[PDB]
Amino acid sequence: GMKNFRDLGGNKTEDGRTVKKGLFYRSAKLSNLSENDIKILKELNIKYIFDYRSDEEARKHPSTIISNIKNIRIPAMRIEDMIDGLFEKDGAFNMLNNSYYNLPINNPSYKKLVELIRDYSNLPILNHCTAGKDRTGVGSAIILMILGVSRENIMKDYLKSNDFADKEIERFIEYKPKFKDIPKENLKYIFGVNEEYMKTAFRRIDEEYISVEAYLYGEFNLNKEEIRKLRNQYLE
Ligand SMILES: [Cl-]
Ligand SMILES: [Cl-]
Ligand SMILES: [Cl-]
Ligand SMILES: [Cl-]
């Protein structure tokens, strides 16, 4: 089917409301969808699929076409080798952390995503990258910030990608049995997500802005009254 897929609805906000279901979805890539997968997405009435991937990723893994669903792609970024040097100075843990540091500020992809979600007529939307975990992690976190979800609850939704990671780790060990005794928690830094990555994205926000509200105003021109309006539309 479709991997790492979930509705952001049901998350609690700091003001006591809950995000409405059926408006914001996130997933991993949408290539080689079955006709049943297409039926699911059509029955959810999704209007836009928002793709964070690079030109090369989209060329190698084109999304399946769905009648009546419009696709918008804007790149949000500018295995054996990763495993060996995983924790070294220039290794994959440090490099992925650095990617998260660079994601939330001056991002043309997230700016377009926020522009889309500012109008109810554009919803429902689905946002995805390749694994649905890093670029979609920060983009979905931004949606949740706009909606008023706490950092603790943003982190919980972010870490849900580790269920997909567990399946990806098993798939990888089938491909390369020589790594069957690498600690699974170590492979999760590559195939999954970790609190430090999202904390690095938060830290960039906090270094640049005194509050999440200031960040949303500075990066997306979302003033307080506009945030109030969106919350009244999208929360129950
Ligand atoms: Cl999954
Ligand atoms: Cl900016
Ligand atoms: Cl092997
Ligand atoms: Cl944490």
Resolution (A): 1.5
Q: 179 φ, ψ to 5°?
A: -100, 15
What's phi and psi for 154, nearest 5 deg? -60, -45
Q: Are 135 and 76 in contact (CB under 8 A)?
A: yes
**What amino acid is encoded at 20 in this protein?**
K
- In the chain, the largest separation of any two C-alpha atoms, in whole Å, equals 56
| Nearest ligand (C-alpha, residue 28) | 1
Identify the nearest ligand to the CA of 201 by its number: 4
Q: How far, in Å, is the centroid of ligand 3 from the Cα of 79? A: 12
SS3 71: strand
- Checking DSSP bridges between strand 6-7 and strand 48-51, what pairing results, if any? unpaired
The one-letter amino acid code at 131 reads A
Task: Give the H or E element holding residue 42.
Answer: helix 35-43
Two structure tokens written together for 167: 């399946």
φ/ψ (deg, to 5) at 73 = -125, 125
Instruction: Give the dihedral of Cα atoms 48, 50, 55, 58; nearest 10 deg.
Output: -70
- Residues 149, 19 contacting (CB under 8 angstroms): yes
Dihedral angle sign, alpha carbons of residues 99, 52, 167, 149: positive
- This structure was determined by X-ray
Phi, psi torsion values for 35, nearest 5 degrees? -65, -30
Distance CA 12, CA 42 (A): 27
Q: Which ligand is nearest to the CA of 6?
A: 1
Around Cβ 64, how many Cβ atoms within 10 Å?
17
Q: Which residues contact 126 (CB under 8 A, 6 or more apart)?
A: 25, 26, 27, 30, 41, 46, 48, 49, 50
How far is the C-alpha of 157 from the C-alpha of 151, rounded, in Å? 10
AA identity, residue 4: N
Q: How far is the CA of 196 from the centre of ligand 4 (A)?
A: 7
Sign of CA dihedral 63, 65, 66, 69: positive
Whether the CB-CB separation of 220 and 120 falls below 8 Å is answered with: no
Whole-number Å distance, alpha carbon 218 to ligand 2 midpoint, is 7
Q: What residues pack around ion ligand 3 (CB closer than 5 A)?
A: 176-178
